């Protein structure tokens, strides 16, 4: 072993399984051991691990899933889509945090909010998995981003965790001290989301009509779905069914009549 060379194209030092304990500085290396390697060998890589960023470990190249990517995914154009990858790394970090507070949780009788955290975690991990692919349309990207940010900041909220701003594109543009007032109004908008969710926890977690009115105040057009199953009537002749919406108080119809042809055999014609 010799010939180690400093480089910064290894930020994703990827394990393959629990590594053998061959090195004095290596162990049964955990699956997601994204290690900040410092030095390059052809078959091996030694550097900082995520578990201990102050320790080295020489790890096989056949074991490293080499990723030239660094903390920035646009310089090497590693982005599956620009402006979205920051979100996946940040949410992975928050998942680490969620697991830590999870350890903090079961030891205490917070099982209700514990399970609520559980379901939020399931939703987040599945959203993460599906958006790992960029196959979703741009509208889906925006909607996923909005709802995942809402859920994640809510999770921060009831756990008393600090919050982030810049709703879209990595939530990082605003905290980049670009402005100062725009920062304040961003914090205010986020705290507005907070107050929304704290008042609506008792509104949706308990009741179901307030969410309906809130969603219906965002859209103006609606569609009633009617799925006919079978006509139970004793006619013996051809029947025409004029299905429509009607206003009993106004004594008039609200939708155009839908014509159904019914046969004399008990079956539709």
């Amino acid at each position: 072993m010799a010939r180690w060379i400093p480089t910064k194209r290894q930020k994703y030092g990827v394990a393959i399984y629990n590594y053998n304990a061959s090195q004095d500085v290596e162990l049964s290396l955990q699956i997601g051991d994204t290690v900040h390697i410092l030095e390059m060998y052809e078959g091996w890589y030694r550097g900082y691990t995520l578990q201990n960023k102050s320790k080295k470990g020489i790890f096989p190249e056949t074991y490293i899933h080499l990723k030239e990517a660094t903390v920035e995914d646009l310089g090497q154009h590693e982005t599956v889509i620009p402006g979205e990858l920051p979100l996946v790394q940040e949410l992975t970090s928050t998942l680490r945090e969620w697991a830590v507070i999870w350890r903090k949780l079961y030891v205490n009788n917070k099982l209700t909010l514990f399970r609520q955290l559980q379901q939020m975690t399931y939703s987040l991990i599945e959203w993460r998995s599906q958006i790992l692919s960029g196959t979703l349309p741009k509208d889906e990207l925006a909607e996923l981003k909005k709802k995942v940010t809402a859920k994640i900041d809510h999770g921060n909220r009831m756990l008393g965790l600090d919050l982030v701003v810049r709703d879209d594109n990595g939530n990082i543009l605003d905290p980049d001290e670009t402005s100062t007032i725009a920062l304040f109004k961003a914090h205010e908008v986020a705290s507005k989301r907070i107050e929304e969710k704290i008042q609506e926890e008792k509104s949706i977690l308990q009741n179901l009509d307030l969410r309906g009115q809130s969603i219906f105040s965002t859209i103006h057009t609606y569609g009633l779905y009617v799925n006919f199953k079978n006509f139970v009537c004793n006619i013996g002749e051809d029947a025409e069914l004029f299905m429509a919406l009607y206003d009993p108080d106004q004594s008039t119809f609200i939708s155009e009549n839908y014509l159904i042809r019914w046969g004399s055999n008990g079956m539709p014609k």
């Binding site: 072993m1 010799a2 010939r3 180690w4 060379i5 400093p6 994703y12 990827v14 394990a15 393959i16 399984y17 629990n18 053998n20 061959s22 049964s28 955990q30 699956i31 997601g32 051991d33 994204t34 030095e39 078959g43 091996w44 080295k56 096989p60 190249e61 056949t62 074991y63 899933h65 992975t92 998942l95 680490r96 697991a99 350890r103 079961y106 030891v107 991990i125 790992l132």
Partner: protein, 198 residues
């Protein structure tokens, strides 16, 4: 998932010890336990508090306290943990084999747990329901340093181990674990690191 499964079940111990410390915390906080045939003005509720030192139990005939454990010197503040032979569960409890005035009926077949001590003294106690009965038995077996006999304990084992490995495989996304481990490339016998260490 065969390497995945072997890796998951192979790094067991952390969750096991984790769960058992959770168990012993539950034992320490405890609650009011249940006696035998506490009907004619007998306080069926009574707290059994483990020491935060986890060596002595604070228990005895305390009042019918709905609040549960109350911090004070119980009727007996010692259960000698170093000489508990076992706790019998079910028909092995002799108090169920009682056929006189202390006849326990057939609805407490799963709430029977008698702590063995003094080689003749026992503690035939009842649990409000099965889950915490198994919980207390798990905690005591942890004091015995042994296996856990709560179904909920196996539930936690499985769910948390599965979560933990689940949140590990994010690094291997779009990658595969060879069932045969990758060959270890030859390491040159010299350790003369051309670059400086650390």
């Amino acid at each position: 998932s065969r390497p995945i499964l072997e890796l998951k079940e192979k790094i067991q111990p952390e969750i096991l010890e984790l769960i058992k410390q959770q168990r012993l915390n539950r034992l320490v906080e405890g609650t009011c336990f249940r006696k035998l045939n506490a009907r004619r003005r007998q306080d069926k509720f009574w707290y059994c508090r483990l020491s935060p030192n986890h060596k002595v139990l604070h228990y005895g005939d305390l009042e019918e306290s709905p609040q549960g454990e109350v911090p004070h010197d119980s009727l007996q503040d010692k259960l000698p943990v170093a000489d508990i032979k076992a706790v019998v569960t079910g028909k092995d409890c002799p108090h169920m084999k009682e056929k006189g005035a202390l006849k326990q009926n057939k609805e407490v077949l799963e709430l029977a747990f008698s702590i063995l001590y003094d080689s003749n003294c026992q503690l035939n106690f009842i649990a409000p329901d099965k889950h915490e009965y198994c919980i207390w038995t798990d905690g005591l077996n942890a004091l015995l340093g042994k296996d856990m006999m709560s179904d909920l304990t196996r539930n936690d084992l499985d769910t948390l181990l599965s979560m933990e490995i689940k949140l590990r495989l994010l690094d291997l996304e779009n990658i595969q674990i060879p069932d045969a481990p990758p060959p270890i490339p030859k390491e040159p016998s010299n350790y003369d690191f051309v670059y400086d260490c650390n």
